[PDB]
Design a protein around this ligand. Structure first.
Ligand SMILES: C[C@@H]1O[C@@H](O)[C@H](O)[C@H](O)[C@H]1O
Length: 321
């Protein structure tokens, strides 16, 4: 994994601790192995602000770009231009389309996240009732994939007494996510569960439910940082979130860095059925990963399974991320 190349990571947006942990993990591995890492945080979680960052990376003459896409398709011209300049493009966290990358590094199976969330809603609701999604940007590939996944999973007869009222967008912004939580509550006060598959959205919704005194009546699940959600997690009337899920964003960054170095050094090309082993034997199968065909027609590397954070384990993990 020795490298002397320069690697740009472009996260979704500024002002999001999840993205900072991702970029930290990426930088740590790149630098440990001799490369240079340049991190960019788009001003907002939009395609427009990301394109500006892609263009900056190209201008700096970097060797590799790793990107968490704010839109599945809008980045394609800039990323193609990067490729035309000889830059390896990798995607992580939120996928660019298959034509815009050599490989996607996915935190967990898309289906695994959808299934965990649907089963959580079914459990936490008591088996029936109205629920809503508080998403991030309406264009974000990952939330859209999870939401599509949930909608597929929820067709199963076991979920037939649940009713999804709709999808609201908090844009991965605290204030917007608080405002949309209030909008959800106003639209359906009898809602049983809010599912927020965004670390920003879930902690914003938690804050709103706590402030309104609703933790005993409206429950909350989703995808959140243990560090942010620790005080909201509990199985009683005083905590809105009985449990939620995530994965290690630092390790997501780590793996994306190992894969980036592997692309630059030519150890992999992104093609299905290729394998690589990273120094870190806690990832994969004793460090080993295989590239698999992805549903979007590209290829992907899957970091691990989702991890459930609940009262029995939340405090220890809150110090990790
Ligand atoms: C769950 C998590 O939530 C936010 O931090 C971002 O939208 C990120 O892309 C997503 O993976």
């Amino acid at each position: 994994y020795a490298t002397t190349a320069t690697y740009a990571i472009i996260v979704k947006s500024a002002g999001n601790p999840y993205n900072q942990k991702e970029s930290e993990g990426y930088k740590q591995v790149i630098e440990a192995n001799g490369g240079k890492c340049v991190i960019q945080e788009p001003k907002s979680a939009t395609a427009e602000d990301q394109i500006t960052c892609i263009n900056n990376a190209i201008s700096q003459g970097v060797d590799c770009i790793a990107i968490a896409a704010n839109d599945t398709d809008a980045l394609e011209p800039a990323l193609t231009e990067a490729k035309n300049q000889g830059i390896h493009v990798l995607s992580l966290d939120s996928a660019t389309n298959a034509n815009s990358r050599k490989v996607f590094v996915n935190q967990a199976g898309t289906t695994q996240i959808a299934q965990a969330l649907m089963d959580a809603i079914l459990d936490i609701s008591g088996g029936s009732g109205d629920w809503a999604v508080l998403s991030a940007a309406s264009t974000a590939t990952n939330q859209n994939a999870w939401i599509d996944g949930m909608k597929t999973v929820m067709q199963d007869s076991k979920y037939s007494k649940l009713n999804l009222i709709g999808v609201y967008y908090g844009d991965d912004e605290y204030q917007a996510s608080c405002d949309q939580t209030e909008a959800i509550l106003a639209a359906d006060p009898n809602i049983k569960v809010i599912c927020a598959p965004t670390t920003v959205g879930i902690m914003a919704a938690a804050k709103v439910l706590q402030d309104k005194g609703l933790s005993g009546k409206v429950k909350l699940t989703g995808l959140g940082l243990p560090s942010e959600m620790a005080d909201y997690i509990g199985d009683d009337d005083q905590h809105s979130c009985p449990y939620m899920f995530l994965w290690n964003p630092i390790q997501l960054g780590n793996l994306a860095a190992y894969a980036s170095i592997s692309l630059v050094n030519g150890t992999i090309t992104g093609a299905a059925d290729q394998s690589f082993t990273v120094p870190d034997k806690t990832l994969g199968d004793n460090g080993s990963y295989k590239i698999t065909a992805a549903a979007d027609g590209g290829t992907e590397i899957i970091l691990g399974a989702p991890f459930k954070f609940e009262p029995s384990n939340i405090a220890e993990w809150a110090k990790v991320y």
